[PDB]
Write an enzyme that holds these catalytic residues in place. Structure first.
Site, short mmCIF file in Angstrom:
data_model
loop_
_atom_site.label_atom_id
_atom_site.label_comp_id
_atom_site.label_asym_id
_atom_site.label_seq_id
_atom_site.Cartn_x
_atom_site.Cartn_y
_atom_site.Cartn_z
CG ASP E 42 102.17 -57.68 43.27
OD1 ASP E 42 102.84 -58.44 42.55
OD2 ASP E 42 101.73 -58.02 44.39
P1 LIG Z 1 102.68 -53.52 46.55
O1 LIG Z 1 102.47 -52.03 46.59
O2 LIG Z 1 101.52 -54.28 45.97
O3 LIG Z 1 102.77 -54.00 48.08
C1 LIG Z 1 101.54 -54.38 48.75
C2 LIG Z 1 101.56 -53.86 50.18
C3 LIG Z 1 102.32 -54.82 51.08
C4 LIG Z 1 102.27 -52.51 50.19
C5 LIG Z 1 100.13 -53.64 50.68
O4 LIG Z 1 99.54 -52.67 49.84
C6 LIG Z 1 99.86 -53.29 52.13
O5 LIG Z 1 100.42 -52.32 52.65
N1 LIG Z 1 99.01 -54.06 52.79
C7 LIG Z 1 98.63 -53.89 54.18
C8 LIG Z 1 99.81 -53.85 55.10
C9 LIG Z 1 100.37 -55.23 55.26
O6 LIG Z 1 100.62 -55.91 54.29
N2 LIG Z 1 100.59 -55.68 56.49
C10 LIG Z 1 101.14 -56.99 56.78
C11 LIG Z 1 102.52 -57.13 56.23
S1 LIG Z 1 103.72 -57.90 57.35
C12 LIG Z 1 103.08 -59.52 57.35
O7 LIG Z 1 101.90 -59.74 57.42
C13 LIG Z 1 104.02 -60.51 56.80
C14 LIG Z 1 105.01 -60.87 57.82
C15 LIG Z 1 105.15 -62.37 57.95
C16 LIG Z 1 106.52 -62.89 57.69
C17 LIG Z 1 107.53 -62.24 58.58
C18 LIG Z 1 108.92 -62.69 58.32
C19 LIG Z 1 109.69 -63.03 59.55
C20 LIG Z 1 110.44 -64.30 59.46
C21 LIG Z 1 111.83 -64.11 58.99
C22 LIG Z 1 112.79 -65.06 59.61
C23 LIG Z 1 114.16 -64.90 59.09
C24 LIG Z 1 114.60 -66.17 58.46
C25 LIG Z 1 113.44 -66.80 57.75
#
Ligand SMILES: *P(=O)(O)OCC(C)(C)[C@H](O)C(=O)NCCC(=O)NCCSC(=O)CCCCCCCCCCCCC
Ligand SMILES: CCCCCCCCCCCCCCCCCC(=O)OC[C@H](COP(=O)([O-])OCC(O)COP(=O)([O-])OC[C@@H](COC(=O)CCCCCCCCCCCCCCCCC)OC(=O)CCCCCCCCCCCCCCCCC)OC(=O)CCCCCCCCCCCCCCCCC
Ligand SMILES: CCCCCCCCCCCCCCCCCC(=O)OC[C@H](COP(=O)([O-])OCC(O)COP(=O)([O-])OC[C@@H](COC(=O)CCCCCCCCCCCCCCCCC)OC(=O)CCCCCCCCCCCCCCCCC)OC(=O)CCCCCCCCCCCCCCCCC
Ligand SMILES: CCCCCCCCCCCCCCCCCC(=O)OC[C@H](COP(=O)([O-])OCC(O)COP(=O)([O-])OC[C@@H](COC(=O)CCCCCCCCCCCCCCCCC)OC(=O)CCCCCCCCCCCCCCCCC)OC(=O)CCCCCCCCCCCCCCCCC
Ligand SMILES: CCCCCCCCCCCCCCCCC[C@@H](O)O[C@H](CO[C@H](O)CCCCCCCCCCCCCCC)COP(=O)(O)OCC[N+](C)(C)C
Ligand SMILES: CCCCCCCC/C=C\CCCCCCCC(=O)OC[C@H](COP(=O)(O)OCCN)OC(=O)CCCCCCC/C=C\CCCCCCCC
Ligand SMILES: CCCCCCCC/C=C\CCCCCCCC(=O)OC[C@H](COP(=O)(O)OCCN)OC(=O)CCCCCCC/C=C\CCCCCCCC
Lengths: 99, 459, 178, 128, 87, 54, 174, 52, 69
Positions: E42
């Site tokens: 994926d």
């Molecule tokens: P592929 O097409 O399979 O991708 C799947 C996707 C993601 C496109 C899904 O189809 C999708 O759109 N799902 C629904 C939308 C979604 O996923 N929303 C949530 C995504 S953001 C989230 O939940 C994760 C964020 C958490 C981590 C954040 C990072 C921040 C910390 C970084 C700090 C820097 C140093 C570590």
């Protein structure tokens, strides 16, 4: 259009006709001789000869004459105990102050 | 001085009688010979000047300027022959005639012994320059530039004529020797204030002084290459030479009347350097750099100390050479790409290495880099201004910092970076252009080697 | 760089770019490989936890909160590859890149120093000159009347044709020219 | 939660933290499409001129010409004397002049008073 | 300085990394195997694969171009084109 | 550059002078060529010269 | 050396301590000095001897220009241009000579400081006093004449100084 | 090749003038915004975001 | 494998440098040789007192032979 005007001419490149061109003239012979006369006269004559002429120009500013005169004056004055530099440029006897 | 004046008046018929393809060769060869002949005026006395006759005399201040003019004529010939390939024979001869007339008038101006003949000649220098600008300029603004230049100079200089004839009627003579030996103090009165204003303001407009300088960017940007070279190298030095000549009869009123001009010069030096920091045009940047350096010369003349006059003369010579070289480099860049925008062409260091070297040397001499005569003059002026007051050092330091900033900004923008992709008409540099840059730069270094020849009578 | 950009980034593209950036900054924080593997597995666990969501408004809110958290928790001095735009070796060889139009201004003696190369250069120049008209005809045939809606270019549809606007892409200077 | 980031003029707001980046109206999408279309048309024209084999010289940029013209030659015709421009010009042009005049005049007056009273250390001051 | 890359070397290295990936079966992995159509990955897995290739070859692939690399042969071609490898 | 060099240094010395000269030139040259008008002007000049000059 | 005058350019007698080695180790400085004398000093001395032999075959002389004294600006009448010219030229020559005298004294001071080295503050007090006196006199003579200095300006300055001294003496005697 | 109609002009005061200015600078009418007419000499030149 | 290196034309710059060096050394070398020969053989004058009743010339008041000439 508002005029019977010639189109803007294309820029002409001297290297196209004459690959070994010095950029002075379109004619190869005149271009080469212009380069030769400019280089020879300017660089050789003016630079070298004028520089050596200025280097060996006679000391008309009297720098060395002034140094020799100063040496003589210092020797005479410090030999006789006089001050090295007189405090007055002119003679107070010859200067007449108003009453 | 006739042994130098007559060869120019013989340059004229030679140019007008030469063949259609030999005009440039003949003019260049004989101009170089005349410069070599004029090199003999550098042998000056330490006591007084060289009094050839009742009309002409040479001094330790006049000699370097004459040598500079005679050396500058062939360089203007080279640049003009660069940019006038397609012109007709009669018009080429007219251009050479204008340059020769300008040189003749400048020589007579520097050698003239009376203030009235000096005025007549230094006003006669307007006509050839105006004709050159308004006739062989490239863009539309050449007419406006010519009008601005002409009327600034004349509005400055007519009260000078009135004051000169008044001084002659009052004292009996305008001869420089007589007005030097028979000088009397200038009392503090309104009439004396206005006479001082007339003379000083004429030469300040010629300098130019900050606030009276817009004609300089207008003319220098819109003039052809020869006009740009002569205007910055020599025509800006007429004001300094005149001020160094006329200040004999303006004492002690100069002590009180110099404050506004000193403040204008210092603040305008800072302001014009700042303007150079944000210029989208290369010729304008060079023009404002010229304005800043001439403002420094004005400060030196106004403070009027023996250490300031030597610095003023050295800075005038150095600025003439440096500005001429910078204008030539900018003109080569313009002839490559047919535009004066600074960011249009980049990567010229990886496209033209020797020209990058010439740019580096010219920019290093533009800023005060030791032991160049630029630095010698600037340092003498700074020391004299420090003796005058102790905040002038702050102003001079600010100016030096900004000068280095804008010089290196110009160098980096033009030469460094990556080349413009769509500009594919940048042919290799010509032997003519390289020789022009070499003949610009070598005399400056030789004058650095022997510096007492450009320090003026006060040495 | 080689791909024409779109008008906008979709939600999937935004979240994938956030994922890659967060992983890179986490690797910057977690210098050691095993520690980085552990925390990268945890980060992908978070992404997989929020992977399945039908409410696009809630997904956008989660993306916004994740972006804010990343900005707060980013490394002030993240690792950058040497050739990447922020890297220490970026644009170091741009001064060594000289174009072929600059090459063709050589003196005849310089050209004669490399006899075999310039024959092939002339062949390439003839090939370029013999295709420009077909290239411009193809470009003007396939464009919409209003104008190009995107920066993508068509390929060569014919056996004897070359892709339009190919010369500079093909003849661009090498990454280590000198 | 996490401390917020306050954008300034010298530290702008990142795109990922822009609130308008997550509230996309259907009109925003067509606006972006129009911007992309303009960019694509300009890019196509530039690329045709750039890849033309018969072209020798510089591709003149009307945007660059407009910028250079507006920076220098277009300022005065669009200038009007307003209270704001008048005050700013008077200040930035005259205030520094009188400030420096006062500073230098005061310094020289103090120095001259010291010279007249004869209590200024001027020994060895030969060059001036 | 560094030895020049070749097409065979690039292909061998990318297949080496892919076979070291756990989610990919080494036996059914070929140079033309699609990551999502016939390998069952994926978007996140593709992003991780691209990051692994970047770490392997020491250069960054921009996100605009990385999303379109759905095949080991496409990755090989992209790396060769960016590194100016023709043999 | 803008406020001082291109705007106010231009406005004060060279632009104002040109504007004043243009206005005065228009005022002087705006004449309808009427002998009645400028002969009445001559009469006024004659009266002023006779009275104000002694 | 006889090129200059020992009275005009004094040098204290040079006292070089005798070497008193206390170890059996050879002296690398001595060995290198011997090598330098063998390789450089003898060739340069032979070359100079040849050059000086060549010079002695074409020996010619140059003289020191002598200027007689002329009436000065104090004797010159008002607006008498010839006498004023002569007096101004003589005054300028005297000014140049005074500048060279100050230069000589400065050279003495610098040489004495360098020679004394770590004890300059005490042993150079004699040359500091001479420089102080010369600088004071030179400043009183040509301190603030300006760029357009002249014998008339110097005379006016001297008259002002003399009047001030007379006023001070009268005030003191009162 | 640039005509007189492609140069910056006075401050646009009507929607027709603003639309013409936006077309001149290859900008959208909604995205085009001049500097405020304070008499500083900007004219109809667009005010772009202060980014680098 | 050796690859062609695309560079700007250096022939013209080399030609200019060669011409400039040749024309500077065309007169520089003879001038240096002449100065060296003059200094070696016709050495500088020696300062002497003016004989009584003798009136020298300015060149006799100058020291270096080239300056005297
Ligand atoms: P592929 O097409 O399979 O991708 C799947 C996707 C993601 C496109 C899904 O189809 C999708 O759109 N799902 C629904 C939308 C979604 O996923 N929303 C949530 C995504 S953001 C989230 O939940 C994760 C964020 C958490 C981590 C954040 C990072 C921040 C910390 C970084 C700090 C820097 C140093 C570590
Ligand atoms: C307006 C604000 C203003 O007065 O600014 C002065 C200020 C001068 O600087 P400053 O340091 O403030 O002046 C020091 C003292 O205030 C004044 O100095 P001071 O008090 O020690 O006495 C000296 C004073 C003695 O007083 C007089 O002589 C006054 C008699 C009337 C003189 C009228 C002007 C004559 C000369 C023509 C000037 C044309 C411009 O000298 C002058 O007045 C010199 C007159 C010429 C000034 C400079 C001319 C060039 C200006 C360039 C920019 C033009 C735009 O700026 C200008 O003069 C130019 C800008 C304003 C116009
Ligand atoms: C060489 C190096 C460089 C050297 C230096 C170079 C630069 C220096 C030279 C240039 C200096 C700056 C320009 C000098 C003034 C030019 C004024 C001009 O051309 O106006 C025509 C220009 C066009 O005329 P308009 O179309 O009928 O008026 C359009 C306005 O938008 C209509 O505006 P409004 O209707 O909204 O007016 C409201 C307000 C506008 O004024 C303000 O908002 C500023 C208020 C503070 C300034 C006045 C302070 C002093 C007030 C009391 C004075 C008491 C005296 C006893 O009016 C007032 O405050 C009442 C009049 C005040 C007159 C003050 C003098 C008497 O009119 C204006 O700009 C109006 C304001 C004029 C004064 C502005 C402040 C001038 C400060 C000068 C200081 C020196
Ligand atoms: C293209 C890109 C570049 C463009 C550049 C820009 C364009 C330039 C254009 C041209 C510009 C020219 C400007 C005018 C120059 C005119 C000449 C001039 O001013 O001469 C002044 C002056 C010449 O003296 P003078 O005033 O004529 O006469 C005074 C004395 O009476 C004389 O003393 P004396 O009579 O006792 O004997 C001296 C005599 C004889 O000397 C000796 O005999 C010396 C012997 C030494 C070795 C002895 C020991 C070893 C013996 C071995 C064998 C032993 C056994 C056999 C012995 C013999 C048989 C028994 O030698 C000479 O007179 C020759 C001096 C040099 C002449 C140079 C002429 C230049 C002409 C201008 C054009 C130049 C163009 C460039 C090309 C030049 C040619 C390649 O000084 C020099 O020429 C410079 C001498 C420097 C010596 C070394 C100084 C120390 C160096 C280190 C300092 C600290 C480190 C600094 C960094 C490193 C150094 C940079
Ligand atoms: C460490 C770093 C060292 C780097 C230095 C690089 C230069 C090489 C070493 C220097 C060369 C040796 C020094 C030569 C020097 O001494 O000669 C100079 C001579 O240089 C020339 O004078 C420079 C000529 C400058 C004028 C050239 C004009 C050419 C036409 C250009 C006209 C445009 C000029 C416009 C303004 C006049 C100074 O004169 P002077 O030391 O005492 O000569 C001694 C001979 N005496 C004793 C008999 C007097
Ligand atoms: C409008 C306001 C104008 C102000 C600027 C002045 C420019 C207009 C010039 C009109 C004349 C105004 C000044 C008149 C001064 C004058 O006539 O007297 C000077 C004095 C008169 O003395 P006497 O008549 O002999 O009497 C002896 C007393 N016991 O004569 C002189 O010294 C000669 C001076 C020449 C006149 C100078 C007038 C100009 C003043 C300098 C301004 C320079 C302007 C330069 C323009 C450049 C920048 C714009
Ligand atoms: C009471 C006694 C004093 C009375 C007045 C004495 C005059 C003093 C000096 C007058 C300055 C002479 C120049 C001014 C002349 C009038 C200029 C003018 O008419 O303005 C119009 C003119 C444009 O019109 P035209 O070119 O003729 O054709 C238009 C085509 N559509 O405007 C301009 O931009 C021309 C300006 C160019 C030169 C302006 C003069 C520059 C310097 C002026 C002040 C001098 C500064 C002193 C230092």
């Amino acid at each position: 259009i508002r005029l019977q005007e010639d189109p803007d001419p294309e820029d002409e490149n001297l290297y196209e006709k004459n690959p070994d061109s010095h950029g002075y003239d379109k004619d190869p012979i005149v271009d080469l001789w212009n380069m030769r006369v400019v280089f020879f006269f300017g660089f050789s004559i003016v630079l070298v000869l004028g520089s050596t002429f200025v280097a060996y120009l006679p000391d008309y500013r009297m720098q060395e004459w002034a140094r020799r005169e100063a040496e003589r004056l210092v020797k005479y004055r410090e030999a006789n105990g006089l001050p090295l530099m007189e405090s007055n440029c002119f003679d107070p006897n010859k200067i007449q102050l108003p009453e | 001085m006739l042994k130098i004046i007559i060869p120019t008046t013989m340059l004229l018929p030679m140019t007008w009688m030469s063949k259609h393809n030999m005009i440039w060769i003949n003019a260049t060869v004989h101009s170089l010979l005349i410069s070599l002949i004029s090199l003999s005026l550098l042998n000056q006395l330490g006591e007084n000047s060289l009094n050839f006759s009742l009309t002409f005399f040479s001094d330790s201040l006049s000699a370097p300027l004459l040598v500079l003019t005679t050396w500058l004529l062939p360089l203007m010939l080279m640049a003009s022959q660069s940019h006038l390939s397609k012109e007709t024979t009669t018009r080429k001869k007219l251009y050479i005639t204008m340059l020769i007339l300008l040189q003749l008038f400048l020589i007579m101006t520097f050698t003239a012994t009376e203030l009235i003949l000096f005025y007549i000649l230094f006003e006669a220098t307007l006509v050839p320059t105006l004709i050159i600008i308004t006739r062989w300029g490239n863009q539309t603004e050449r007419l406006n530039a010519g009008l601005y230049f002409l009327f600034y100079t004349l509005a400055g200089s007519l009260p000078l004529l009135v004051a000169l004839v008044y001084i002659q009627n009052t004292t009996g003579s305008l001869n420089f020797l007589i007005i030097h030996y028979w000088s009397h103090p200038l009392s503090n009165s309104w009439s004396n204030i206005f006479m001082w204003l007339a003379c000083i303001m004429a030469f300040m407009v010629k300098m130019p002084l900050y606030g009276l300088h817009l004609w300089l960017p207008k003319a220098h940007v819109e003039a052809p290459i020869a006009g740009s070279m002569v205007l910055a190298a020599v025509l800006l030095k007429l004001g300094g030479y005149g001020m160094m000549r006329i200040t004999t009869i303006l004492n002690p009123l100069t002590n009180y009347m110099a404050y506004p001009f000193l403040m204008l010069s210092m603040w305008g030096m800072i302001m014009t350097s700042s303007i150079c920091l944000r210029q989208t045009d290369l010729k304008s940047l060079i023009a404002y750099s010229s304005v800043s350096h001439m403002a420094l010369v004005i400060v030196a003349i106004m403070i009027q100390t023996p250490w300031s006059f030597m610095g003023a003369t050295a800075l005038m010579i150095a600025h003439g050479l440096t500005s001429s070289m910078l204008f030539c480099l900018a003109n080569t860049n313009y002839e490559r790409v047919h535009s004066r925008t600074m960011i249009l062409a980049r990567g010229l260091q990886t496209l033209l290495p020797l020209m990058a070297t010439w740019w580096l040397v010219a920019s290093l001499t533009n800023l005060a880099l030791p032991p160049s005569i630029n630095l010698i003059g600037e340092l003498f002026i700074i020391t004299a201004s420090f003796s005058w007051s102790n905040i002038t050092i702050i102003l001079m330091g600010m100016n030096m910092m900004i000068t280095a900033l804008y010089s290196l900004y110009m160098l980096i923008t033009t030469q460094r970076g990556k080349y413009t992709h769509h500009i594919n008409n940048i042919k290799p540099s010509f032997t003519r252009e390289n020789a022009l840059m070499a003949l610009h730069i070598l005399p400056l270094l030789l004058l650095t080697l022997n510096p007492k020849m450009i320090l003026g009578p006060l040495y | 760089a080689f791909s024409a950009p779109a008008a906008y980034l979709t939600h999937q593209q935004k979240v994938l770019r956030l994922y890659k950036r967060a992983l890179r900054h986490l690797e910057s924080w977690c210098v050691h490989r095993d520690k980085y593997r552990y925390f990268a597995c945890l980060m992908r666990a978070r992404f997989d936890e929020h992977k399945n969501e039908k409410d696009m408004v809630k997904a956008t809110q989660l993306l916004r909160q994740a972006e804010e958290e990343f900005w707060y928790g980013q490394h002030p001095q993240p690792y950058i590859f040497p050739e990447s735009p922020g890297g220490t070796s970026y644009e170091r060889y741009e001064c060594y890149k000289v174009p072929e139009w600059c090459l063709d201004d050589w003196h005849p003696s310089e050209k004669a120093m490399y006899p075999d190369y310039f024959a092939k250069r002339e062949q390439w120049k003839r090939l370029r000159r013999e295709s420009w008209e077909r290239e411009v005809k193809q470009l003007q045939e396939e464009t919409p009347p209003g104008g190009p809606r995107t920066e993508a270019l068509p390929p060569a549809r014919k056996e004897g044709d070359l892709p339009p606007l190919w010369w500079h892409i093909v003849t661009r200077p090498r990454e280590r020219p000198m | 939660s996490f401390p917020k980031y306050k954008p300034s003029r010298l530290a702008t707001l990142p795109a990922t933290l822009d609130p308008a980046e997550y509230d996309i109206s259907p009109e925003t999408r067509k606006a972006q499409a129009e911007r992309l279309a303009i960019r694509s048309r300009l890019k196509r024209e530039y690329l045709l001129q750039y890849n033309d084999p018969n072209r020798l010289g510089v591709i003149e940029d009307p945007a660059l010409i407009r910028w250079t013209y507006a920076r220098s030659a277009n300022i005065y015709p669009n200038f009007r004397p307003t209270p704001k421009t008048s005050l700013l010009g008077a200040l930035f042009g005259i205030g520094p002049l009188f400030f420096w005049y006062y500073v230098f005049k005061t310094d020289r007056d103090k120095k001259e008073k010291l010279i007249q009273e004869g209590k200024l250390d001027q020994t060895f001051n030969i060059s001036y | 300085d560094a030895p020049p890359l070749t097409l065979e070397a690039i292909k061998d290295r990318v297949l080496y990394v892919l076979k070291l990936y756990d989610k990919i079966d080494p036996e059914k992995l070929s140079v033309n195997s699609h990551f999502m159509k016939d390998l069952g990955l994926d978007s996140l897995d593709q992003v991780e694969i691209i990051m692994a290739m970047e770490d392997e070859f020491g250069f960054e692939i921009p996100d605009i171009d990385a999303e379109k690399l759905m095949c080991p042969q496409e990755i090989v071609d992209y790396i060769a084109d960016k590194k100016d490898v023709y043999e | 550059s803008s406020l001082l060099d291109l705007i106010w240094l231009e406005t004060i010395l060279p632009k104002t002078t040109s504007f004043i000269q243009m206005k005065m030139s228009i005022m002087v040259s705006n004449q309808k060529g009427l002998i009645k008008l400028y002969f009445l002007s001559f009469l006024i000049t004659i009266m002023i010269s006779m009275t104000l000059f002694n | 050396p006889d090129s200059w005058d020992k009275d005009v350019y004094p040098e204290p007698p040079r006292r070089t301590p005798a070497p008193a080695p206390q170890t059996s180790l050879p002296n690398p400085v001595t060995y290198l000095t011997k090598i330098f004398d063998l390789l450089v000093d003898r060739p340069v001395t032979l070359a100079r001897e040849f050059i000086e032999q060549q010079h002695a075959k074409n020996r010619y002389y140059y003289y020191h220009r002598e200027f007689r004294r002329v009436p000065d600006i104090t004797e010159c009448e008002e607006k008498d241009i010839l006498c004023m010219f002569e007096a101004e030229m003589q005054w300028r020559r005297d000014y140049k000579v005074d500048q060279e005298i100050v230069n000589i004294i400065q050279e003495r001071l610098k040489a004495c400081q360098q020679r004394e080295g770590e004890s300059y503050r005490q042993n150079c007090a004699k040359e500091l006093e001479q420089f102080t006196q010369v600088s004071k006199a030179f400043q009183d003579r040509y301190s603030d004449l300006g760029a357009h200095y002249s014998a008339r300006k110097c005379l006016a300055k001297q008259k002002q100084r003399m009047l001030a001294e007379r006023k001070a003496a009268k005030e003191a005697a009162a | 090749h640039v005509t007189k109609d492609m140069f910056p002009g006075p401050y646009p005061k009507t929607p027709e003038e603003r639309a013409a200015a936006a077309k001149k600078y290859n900008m959208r009418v909604e995205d085009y915004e001049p500097y405020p007419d304070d008499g500083m000499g900007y004219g109809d030149y667009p005010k772009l975001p202060d980014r680098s | 494998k050796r690859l062609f290196i695309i560079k700007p034309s250096g022939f013209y710059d080399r030609r200019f440098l060669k011409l400039m060096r040749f024309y500077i050394l065309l007169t520089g070398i003879p001038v240096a040789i002449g100065i060296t020969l003059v200094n070696v053989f016709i050495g500088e004058a020696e300062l002497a007192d003016i004989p009584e009743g003798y009136v020298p010339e300015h060149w006799e008041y100058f020291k270096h032979p080239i300056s005297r000439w």
